């Protein structure tokens, strides 16, 4: 067995090997392998992306104006964010400035996605790691009611209501057809909620499942449909007509009224259902404020997002702050430049790709996506992996680094960056949340902290929605209706050669599209996606990524049932199609 030291961890692949394949309740395909010592503690962690499509290859030679549509299909979960990145990138390359309304609408589209994505992840993806669904059958409805009413203003909390929910579930299982609940980890000692909290949680799971469909109606108004709304280089295609003939064929007052009605309902659900449930899971699972820290107390990254000044991506404009912290020095938030070939680089020495020299990292403007499945000796065959050789190539995910540093991205990363940059709203919000939990600030840097930060982000985004909508309506009252810049729509107007970068903060972290245009066609298109960062394989220095770091030193109560592994991974909200694209 091998043994080595990196980023304060001892990577030791002696001992017993555990394989979790497939990882469920995530987007896409992931394989995870670990080694545990005699004490049942994880001494080695292996993150593996088990899918590849090759969008970067497919985009070669196509019209830059069509790009958004291709890349949007990188992910149907974070649907829209890649299209935003794409139009950003192409507009950066060509030199296009979009109208104010187009920027506001784009912010709305992003905020909407944040609200929807965070919500669904909390309940439908991460939820059953914390909520013992079968234990809810043992709850007292009246008591469940009292618990719910003690935590929230939410109206749906009657004893009859929880009794009904409990009965529907009881009927459901009494048939032996447990469906998605079958062969679960129910009764695992790490399940810590009382029966009443489980019933409350499960009821809210159902309520979230219903309501999530409503949120995306905002995407349907401005982008036509969800999943995969439509966008254009130069702004948005949803022309606005309030007060003139033919307003029936455009975004009108009635359409806007619908949008406003969704925003109110979304903020109401997030603030009074998701928020208190997040807080409740916190109260009952406090030890997890010290588990799965990983890189979150060492290296965190945010590009920043939500430019409030149109076409300005500077520090004075982005409502979601950007910056990087390395070596645990949260006292110096470092500026990020996505053009700098010294900052963002991708390594493939532990990934299934080909470089001229795999011992060096390539900035995406120098990016190469040459896929070659070469696993090496994997205690099986080539079509029968029993164990990934983590010494060699073991993933379809590239290994991104920032100035050579392995970083964590996402809600926790962003929260830390915003907090230490001194964003007043953020500081106040976080301290209140932790004060309520009677935990230190440090407790955020954990598996539990990721979930808490995600919920807080949903609340932040919901608030932002209303802000953006008000901005839009103010423009409309002032007769500012423009939604697109057509001026450089024709390829004949473009520079013969040009390149650009589009960046934003996806629900899962820092996203970037790097695009090079030659002769009206795409000469290069490279994507570095948030889960690419977090689920990253090792580099030539043997540095481990966010997932592998977070799983290190984790105690498992029963290794035949990887509940602790699932809890930590799910806290990152893995999107594997995003990571590999």
């Amino acid at each position: 067995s091998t043994q080595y030291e990196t980023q304060g961890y001892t990577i030791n692949n002696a001992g017993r090997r555990l394989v979790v394949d497939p990882i469920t309740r995530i987007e896409g395909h992931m394989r995870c392998e670990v080694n545990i010592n005699d004490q049942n503690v994880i001494t080695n962690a292996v993150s593996c992306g088990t899918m590849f499509r090759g969008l970067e290859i497919i985009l070669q030679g196509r019209d830059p104006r069509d790009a958004w549509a291709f890349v949007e299909r990188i992910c149907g979960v974070c649907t829209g964010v890649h299209a935003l990145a794409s139009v950003y990138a192409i507009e950066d390359a060509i030199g296009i400035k979009v109208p104010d309304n187009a920027n506001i609408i784009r912010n709305i589209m992003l905020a909407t996605l944040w609200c929807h994505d965070h919500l669904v992840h909390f309940y439908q993806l991460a939820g059953m790691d914390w909520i013992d669904v079968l234990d809810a059958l043992k709850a007292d409805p009246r008591k469940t009611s009292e618990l719910a009413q003690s935590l929230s203003s939410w109206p749906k909390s009657s004893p009859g209501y929880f009794f009904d929910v409990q009965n529907r579930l009881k009927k459901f299982v009494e048939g032996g057809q447990l469906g998605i609940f079958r062969n679960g980890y129910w009764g695992h000692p790490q399940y810590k909620l009382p029966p009443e909290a489980n019933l409350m949680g499960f009821a809210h799971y159902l309520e979230a499942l219903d309501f999530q469909r409503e949120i995306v109606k905002i995407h349907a108004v401005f982008g036509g449909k969800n999943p995969h709304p439509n966008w254009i280089v130069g702004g948005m295609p949803c022309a606005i007509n309030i007060d003139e003939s033919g307003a029936v064929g455009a975004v009108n007052m009635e359409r806007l009224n619908l949008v406003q009605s969704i925003i109110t309902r979304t903020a109401d659900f997030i603030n009074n259902v998701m928020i208190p449930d997040a807080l409740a899971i916190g109260q009952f699972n406090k030890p997890w404020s010290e588990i799965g820290t990983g890189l979150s107390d060492k290296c965190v990254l945010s590009y920043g997002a939500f430019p409030d000044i149109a076409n300005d991506f500077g520090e004075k404009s982005l409502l979601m702050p950007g910056g990087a912290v390395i070596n645990g020095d949260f006292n110096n938030v470092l500026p990020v430049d996505l053009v700098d070939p010294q900052q963002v680089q991708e390594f493939v020495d532990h990934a299934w790709y080909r470089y001229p020299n795999d011992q060096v990292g390539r900035h995406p403007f120098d990016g190469i996506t040459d896929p070659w499945y070469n696993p090496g000796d994997v205690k099986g065959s080539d079509t029968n992996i029993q164990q990934l050789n983590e010494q060699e190539r073991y993933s379809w995910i590239k290994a991104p680094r920032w100035r050579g540093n392995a970083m964590e991205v996402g809600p926790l990363a962003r929260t830390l960056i915003a907090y230490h940059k001194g964003d007043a709203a953020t500081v106040e919000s976080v301290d209140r949340m932790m004060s309520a939990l009677n935990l230190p600030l440090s407790g955020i840097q954990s598996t539990l902290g990721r979930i808490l930060c995600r919920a807080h982000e949903a609340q932040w985004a919901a608030g932002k929605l209303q802000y953006f909508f008000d901005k839009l309506m103010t423009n409309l009252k002032n007769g500012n209706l423009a939604t697109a810049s057509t001026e450089k729509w024709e390829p004949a107007t473009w520079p013969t050669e040009c390149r650009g970068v589009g960046f934003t903060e996806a629900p899962r972290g820092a996203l970037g599209h790097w695009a090079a245009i030659r002769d009206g066609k795409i000469d290069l298109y490279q994507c570095v996606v948030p889960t690419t960062w977090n689920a990253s394989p090792r580099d030539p220095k043997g540095q481990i990524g966010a997932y592998e770091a977070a799983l290190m030193n984790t105690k498992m109560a029963i290794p035949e049932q990887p509940l602790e592994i699932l809890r930590t991974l799910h806290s990152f909200d893995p999107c594997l199609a995003c990571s590999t694209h």
Partner: protein, 296 residues
């Protein structure tokens, strides 16, 4: 009563089809899962992972052999011995074949499973292949779209449960009920199309009056789907209604049919970006060359 067992597997995909499914307004996805069917395997939603997930899979396909519906999202890659998509350390295609073998029928959700969708576009790095090219001995219902309409997905499901039969299909395996007509056949902007009233550039006066998007590249005229009638997300809107032309996303190989913003589009079997105007005008200018060289 017992509900019909459904196994939902995922190949190469963006999970947009799963996302669409849970947008269903009537019936709610919640009620489908709870009351109408038995969703017995689905990687996106199931509690069990790893070896627990594998046990579920084998147990369902064995105990309900020949009696379950197989729902397929995404498609299998043939490249690199299938290891472009790996499930439980093996090529996804093996799972697919194993699942297909015991299914009484197969639903191919979206353009991915139906046709190939984005990953199958030029140059298809992974050799992504639609399900009906791999499984040839089972009834396959193609429900294309990227993704299909949420309420179309659920209506198809409720139909099969209620009427206890597969929906009638066109010569392509698409359900006639929602794919029997083209978008252009039921588009509320047809009045402008036939009048010759078109948006020419984004956000012009034409666009602000909801004029036709044909000259902006709308592929409605060649795309079979229910978007212009059923519409999207509880009837709120659809692409054209929010001002962008139909991309053709319900249609086989739509990605490689040229610019989305052009009426005249790429002919794949004839070059990288040669279209009918490219190849046609070249031939017209080549005869004019012969006709004027010889005439001197």
């Amino acid at each position: 009563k017992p509900r019909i067992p459904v196994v939902w597997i995922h190949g190469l995909e963006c999970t947009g089809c799963t996302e669409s499914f849970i947008r269903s307004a009537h019936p709610l996805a919640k009620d489908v899962i709870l009351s109408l069917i038995s969703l017995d395997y689905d990687d996106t939603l199931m509690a069990a992972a790893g070896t627990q997930a594998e046990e579920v899979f084998e147990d369902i396909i064995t105990q309900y052999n020949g009696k379950y519906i197989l729902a397929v999202e995404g498609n299998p890659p043939l490249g690199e011995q299938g290891m472009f998509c790996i499930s439980s350390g093996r090529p996804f295609i093996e799972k697919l074949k194993r699942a297909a073998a015991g299914a009484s029928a197969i639903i191919a959700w979206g353009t991915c499973a139906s046709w190939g969708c984005v990953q199958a576009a030029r140059p298809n790095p992974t050799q992504a292949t639609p399900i009906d090219k791999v499984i040839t001995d089972k009834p396959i219902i193609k429900v294309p779209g990227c993704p299909p309409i949420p309420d179309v997905m659920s209506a198809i499901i409720t139909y099969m449960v209620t009427f206890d039969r597969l929906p009638d299909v066109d010569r392509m395996g698409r359900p006639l009920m929602f794919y029997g007509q083209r978008i252009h056949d039921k588009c509320y902007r047809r009045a402008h199309f036939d009048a010759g009233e078109f948006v020419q550039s984004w956000d012009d006066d034409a666009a602000r009056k909801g004029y036709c998007l044909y000259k902006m590249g709308c592929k409605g005229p060649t795309t079979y789907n229910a978007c212009s009638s059923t519409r999207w997300n509880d009837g709120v809107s659809f692409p054209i209604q929010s001002g962008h032309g139909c991309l053709g996303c319900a249609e086989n190989g739509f990605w490689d049919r040229g610019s989305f913003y052009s009426r005249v589009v790429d002919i794949p079997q004839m070059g990288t970006h040669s279209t009918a105007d490219t190849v046609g005008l070249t031939a017209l200018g080549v005869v004019a060359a012969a006709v004027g060289v010889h005439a001197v």
